[PDB]
Amino acid sequence: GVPCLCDSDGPRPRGNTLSGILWFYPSGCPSGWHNCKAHGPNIGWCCKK
């Protein structure tokens, strides 16, 4: 998988500008994730654990 930049991708700890992974889920983020970029990308929603 890839880490990507997000929407609230600012006040986050380690990773800060990459503390989220892209997601290949039609329902948004998969079970255990909670989104990072509520704006995409289209190449999988970037979410995080």
Q: What is the DSSP letter of 43?
A: S
Contact by Cβ (8 Å): 6, 37:
yes
Q: What is the DSSP letter of 9?
A: -
Give the span between the Cα atoms of 27 and 10, in whole angstroms. 25
Residue boundaries of the structural domains of the chain? 1-49
Structure determination technique employed: NMR
Indicate the residue type of 46: C
- CA torsion 41-14-33-8 (nearest 10°) is -50
Contact by Cβ (8 Å): 20, 28:
no
Domain 1-49 falls in which CATH fold?
A: Anthopleurin-A (2.20.20)
